[model samples]
Target: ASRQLVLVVVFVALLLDNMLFTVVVPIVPTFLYDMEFQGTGFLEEEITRVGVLFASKAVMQLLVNPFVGPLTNRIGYHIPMFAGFVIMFLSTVMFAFSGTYTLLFVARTLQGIGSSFSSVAGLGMLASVYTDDHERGRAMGTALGGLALGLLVGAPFGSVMYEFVGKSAPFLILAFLALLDGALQLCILKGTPLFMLLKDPYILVAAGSICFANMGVAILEPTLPIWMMQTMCSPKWQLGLAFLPASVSYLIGTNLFGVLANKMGRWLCSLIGMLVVGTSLLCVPLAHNIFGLIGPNAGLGLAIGMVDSSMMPIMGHLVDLRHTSVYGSVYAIADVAFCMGFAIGPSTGGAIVKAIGFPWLMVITGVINIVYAPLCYYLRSPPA
Candidate 1:
């Protein structure tokens, strides 16, 4: 098959993969409440249960990725991608038909496993298809661009589907896409190491920065949909649409932030990036109308772009400075940081919102970012 075919597949696979992550955002809370399950009587507790459902996928991915990556490298990409799709297919079925809390938990865990397999395998195959540094970078850029694009489409589309079609409609659609992707991978498509790299002080700091920054961004993931519904009495589709302004800004601003990273210096960009995140979280509670949500969401996306843009350049530098064969390992540490944030953030945010209020939860999350911002400046610099 042509490389173009493979690239197209890569883009589509990533799009579906990310959709699996965001597609549930608007519907989960409403779904749980509709389920009218016992032990979920209050709105607050229901929100917390929803948070678990959301975070469970990330937690499973975090646990499974290390094993998945190495297994992919050994057995090659196509098999793993196929296996991933099959797993996701089953997961989607389970979610679509879920009649009990236990079934929902089981489905989420499988979804995470499927996600790890598809993502790692797809990225590896994409990397293999492009031999040149520039070409490979472009391929990666396209893949991630699709991932961001997935964020753009997933929430709104899922909400609309759930609201109008049926509760199972969103996952049913995604399941078909996953089936196509899995078959394509089986027909067409197709890394690293250990603790010694963890010894680097700067590396550890960079990982911490990624984790904390992502935590701030993710803290609202499970809550935002509920918050919007409570505050504005918005519909499910509108709840999904709420993510648009930020996601659009993120797609555009991320590239722009790359330019800023170069000009301001990566470290400075890191500090500013995080500061934007912290400040944006603080502003979230202040939004009384739909228009108000747009500002904070847009600002949050840009802030996260800054941090995302800076971290790689810095990590790349550290890799060169150390002259180690552990580029794969170092980068993996960064992935761990991101997964950790997603895994932990929503669950904690749910509890906080239950204990305090949504407003105070945002305030507390904002303060965490603020306190952590200056620490970015202290990361150990590479040798001249």
Candidate 2:
């Protein structure tokens, strides 16, 4: 019963956190342009600026993980989790009223710091509570469903609200949600160092898989909205709706592949996911219209879900098998891998897209995934 309650608490917390994180996806480009653009003079630099804006949160997450992970182990999970919520609330309020680019960037970075605390604490608590491998996989997958749902809803929510209501509307509404989330958190409470664990081959494999998988998705975030506007002449609302297929597919994939991980073998699922991701990314550049892009995006989303659901549980399993059941330190490695992927994706990907064009960037990213798929074999067998 308590386990079920823990799942609910963690699920809602992650859902709120991710929703706030992604709410800017559809709004950022337009928001930045409206605030800063005087003429067509600096249009080329806008993409890089957008990339940096998106990357700021992950950069903070990357830095925060090293400290937060170890701290969670010392204090209880509930304290960090509640503290994170408080910080996120403040960040959301800041975003609601931010007038300058620097302010927006700072707000985003603050959110990242808050996310690092919540994410590490939430996952660590989940791992500690669910002891069995199969049950653990399902629980983690369901928890991550909140993540996918947030992505699914956030863009559209941001786009539609920003279009109809105003720029501050979405942020203010989310701030209220954050407030309610805190109140609920008051009822039921919950819940890492980076380098030392790399000595283990399993840790390295899991981290590598998650890092590459997320990079594929993160690369698309900054570039895709601009690409759609430029090539397809899509409306702002469409920018958010375009992600619908992928988010829906991702939600399904996480639940389905998560349940199947025990039967399929986690490493095998990862291999298959990598292959699919590479194929879908290669296909994305070939599409000429927005509708044509849906299939490939859905494929990419599903593949990401597969990789994440499979690998995340492996983090907990590895801890149970080798280390103590205390999960903060181990899960922190997973968070860092995620932050690295997100950080590297947008920060470098924007420049790469500008240099080589979107098509070639996709091709290069696709090929990298294909080439790396075979390495999953190293992780095929677990110790007895």
Candidate 3:
């Protein structure tokens, strides 16, 4: 197969996997709330616990991320990756069968671990193979391009899945995708003596970029769902549209920013993505309904798509192209921020909406995102 073909196959699997994982976020809280996790309801305290679970996933990744760069360097990509996939498959199944909040946490934690392995190894693989400078930018673009699709596709689609197949059904579908990702690794991503990618400067830059950019993202995630549920008056089937805006925004921001980044430079494109999303975040609380949410979510999606697309190829330059899984720490940033945001957003949203009204909530997020714009410049200077 052509290098491009191999790259697409490998990264597409990553995208599919992530799509399955993230789709549950906006909708699942409602399910858990309905299930009465932690307190027999998805109230403020229960929501806070959910946020902690999300952060726990991040905390786990943070502790493990440093090791991913070297340990995967020590172990070959195929073995660890294979093991991770099996674990992921099992984890997804377990999630579908989770009978209690504790079980859900355990299932998600294992899934997070599995994701860390696959992400670092898979990223390493991309860096190793896409050596030609000309194609490297686009290579990362494609991998993260798939990831953006996950964020958008997962939420609305997951909601629709819930509507049709019912809860736990979406998780079962995720298990199938995990199985397929493993098969592709075993049969298609074949190689021995995979190149070491940790040394690549591009990987260093991209990874750093993703890490901080994701912190803002984490702050936004947990809150968004709660925001939708509360703001939209918990309208059924319709809130799925919120995911649609992000999805559409992802398509636009990634394709446009990606090309601009490739032609103009990573620094410029990264700034655009951050500023747009950050600013959009500030706008999110301003939204009165789904449309209001969509506008900011689109910005958020676009910014994330741009940031995410670059990491794989950059990491490819760092180590084995297939070992992106080793960098599970990237997802760690996502989950941590997501979890923290969940804790922070929901608790605040509820209290604020009760005391100050929903507009205040929107203003708060908007300002935070606006503040994030300047940080992009910090990324311009190499990580100290």
Candidate 4:
């Protein structure tokens, strides 16, 4: 199959996986409230349940990620990646039919498993195909274009579908996308494997950077909406729209940084990206109005785009550097790091915000990123 086709396959797989993962965000509360239940204060408790749903996926992904790398190595990529798509499809359909809390939780866990498999396999496949460092970076960036669009659309897509079509409409549509992604993978792409990636100090550092970057992004996930609601008296759509600038900027940054990585080198681009992100995080909480929020948010999107675009490419490049066949294991470790960030960020941020105020929360996050920037200088050195 053509490189373009392979890229498309990876892109759609990521897009569908992420979209399904988050598609219930905007509608979860209402969906739960409307469900038949025989309990008092269920409405207020349902609010907490939404957090559980999100956590279910992240936690399952974290637990399941390590196995995917070795599984892909033992069985090859096509079967695992295809299996993930099938799992995702079943989960989505189950979500549509989910009438009980247990069913919803089970479906979400299934979605998490599917996400874990597809993410590891798809990225491993990408690394297997794109051999050049710069080319690989650019290819990963292109694939993340799907991720950007997924984040941009998933929330609003859920709310809109729930409002206009029905609760199940969004997942139903995603089911077809999942099917298409699986069929494409089965037909076009083969899988890859791992070596001593976990032992490579350089790969470990790269994986750590991925974790920190994701944590920085997720730190705001739970608190941002609460802050906006308390401080600005914003409504639900405003809360959803708050994510717009960052999402759009991320789309631009991926392509832009992909090119820049080729011209400027991953180390230089990463440091610059870190600085931009840190500065923006520091500035984000200063906004007093709706429009004021856009600047820092967009800056964050741009910075994340560049930083993350460099991360996987460098990881993929390390496979060739270390003369290993552990792309699956390498990406599994990376995915676990990211999942750890997501798992920890909101709870940590929420606790910090309660103790020190939201301003300090952003400030602390910014400081951590700034401190992280100097670490990327290590990426510039020769691997030993």
Candidate 5:
């Protein structure tokens, strides 16, 4: 019963973390364009600027992952989890009131720091509580379902709210949600060393799969909305709603594949996910209309879900099989992979799009995913 409550708390915490992280997606490009260019003609410079803004959070998270992982292992999950929430609350307030681009960047950077704490700690807490392999996979999938739901809700939530309610309204509402999440943390509360796990090949393979999977999605965050606006003349609300298909599919993918991993084995699930991700990326550039885009987007979501659900449980299983039961360090490694993918995706994707156009950029990334598929095979069997 207590385990159920822990799952609930951790699930909500991850949901809120991802929700705030993504809320700016549909709105920020236009927000900055209006603020900086006075709603003038679009420029290549604007894409790069938006990319930087998007990357800031991941970069901060990347920097903090190493320390936060070890720290969580030392002090336990609860304190770091709550502390991260407090930081996120402050960042949301900043997002609500700040007018300048610099302030917005700073707020996003702070959010990255906060997310590092919550994600590492939250996942660590879940792993600690759910010891059974199949049960752990299911719980992790359900928790990640919260993450997918947040992504599902956040884009539309931001775009719709920004269009109708006012710019500050969404952030203000999220801040309140943050407070409520914190109180829940107050009610129910909750890892690993850092370096020892690095020697294991299984851990590295798992981390690599996670990194590439996330990079594919992160690349879209900055590049996709603008492309839609330019090509389809999509409205702001449509930009937000466009992500709905992917997030919905992703939520399904996580839960469905989470169960399937126990049956099919993690490597096979991951390999299949990578192939689909590559195919989906290739398809993304083919769609000229909004509705046509949904199929590819949903494919991306489902493929990513398969990769994540399989790989996450594999990380815990690797620890159970070989390393000490310390989960913090392993999860930190996973977080680092995630941060690297997110940080690299937007920061470079914007420039790549500017140089070669969106089609080529997707093709190149798609090929990368296909090429990496073979690596999953190496992870097929762990050391006895």
Candidate 6:
């Protein structure tokens, strides 16, 4: 139970980190479009530009990918943790000043690299502290609360940020908050920097699953909102409507799947969740209007949440706790998949919609996602 304190800290930090990562979604593309029209012009003039910018964050992940896992094996987790937050802070400040697309790419890349470290470190620490098998799912679930909440709130909140300060100011302020988080972590974390828990393996396996799950998220997180803004003629609040179900469903799935996996076993739980996910994506094309979207997304969110809630716990079971760093790194790599999905999804969606229409794009996405669902079930538990 004493570990509860540290878990709380980790969850809060996760929430803040995700919020910082996603808060710009609604506002940034419009800002970029305006900049290019204003003749600021370092951007490639295609729908792919946005996708590339979104994917740019993962570029750092790619660079950090091969090394990050091994880095945790070598260095103390604290250094990498500290390093990640600093990167996040620095990137946030830079994002504010971004006038052209090139600058935007630079900023996101830094954030990805920083996130790569901090996120890994944070999860690693949680794994270190929460040792009981019963506690692992709860720990990951509690930690994942931040990401779900971020999605719930992401709609046009950026518009408010834009109006209140300016384009760059929100990121500037978020950078400061990230700094404070690092300072807090420094104050609270008491374990040895070189502790073997930072090098654990069981955590790494669970992390592998998370990497895949989050990859799904990272791509869609940036893509879905943009899709609505570009196509649908819905109320501004509809942005909230569009995203809210996914978050709510994700939370449901996380907790529910966590329970099922805890009882029935991880493989079975993954199978059920993937089934639901495939079904959800397939429904994306049929939403003749906004109401059509809600049910499908809610189901998808539920599946995602369950996968997430159960994933890291499975990691903790399969390997040593030190592998949390490895887990984080793995998750970020999966996020690269997520980014790739976004890159491919929107451009393809845009081109398809331009040629045929949105209904078909949704249908195609659904088919692709459905095909991928069963494959996830094929992954078994990690080696102990």
> Of the candidates shown, which would achieve the greatest lDDT relative to the real structure?
5
Superposition error at 309 for model 4 (Å):
3.0
lDDT of each: 0.78, 0.81, 0.61, 0.74, 0.82, 0.60
Q: Evaluate model 1: give its TM-score.
A: 0.92
What lDDT would candidate 1 get against the real structure?
A: 0.78
Residue-by-residue lDDT tens digits, candidate 6, 216-246: 4444544465566555655443454466677
Cα lDDT tens digits, model 2, 43-114, are 456788888888888887877776875698788788998888889988999988888789888889889988
Sorting all predicted structures by TM-score, with the top scorer first, yields 1, 5, 2, 4, 3, 6
Point to the candidate with the largest TM-score. 1
TM values, all candidates: 0.92, 0.87, 0.72, 0.77, 0.87, 0.71
- For candidate 2, give the lDDT: 0.81
Worst 10 residues of 1 by lDDT: 186-195
The Cα RMSD of model 3 versus the native structure comes to 6.7
TM-score of 3: 0.72
RMSD of each: 2.9, 3.6, 6.7, 4.9, 3.4, 6.4
* TM-score winner, 1 or 4: 1
Report how far residue 321 has shifted in candidate 6, in Å: 16
Candidate 4's displacement at residue 339, Å, is 2.1
How would you encode candidate 3's per-residue C-alpha lDDT over 269-324 as one tens digit per residue?
67666567657666666666666665667677778777765443444333343344
Q: Which one wins by TM-score: 3 or 5?
A: 5
Lowest summed lDDT window (length 10), candidate 6: 189-198
As a TM-score, model 2 comes out at: 0.87
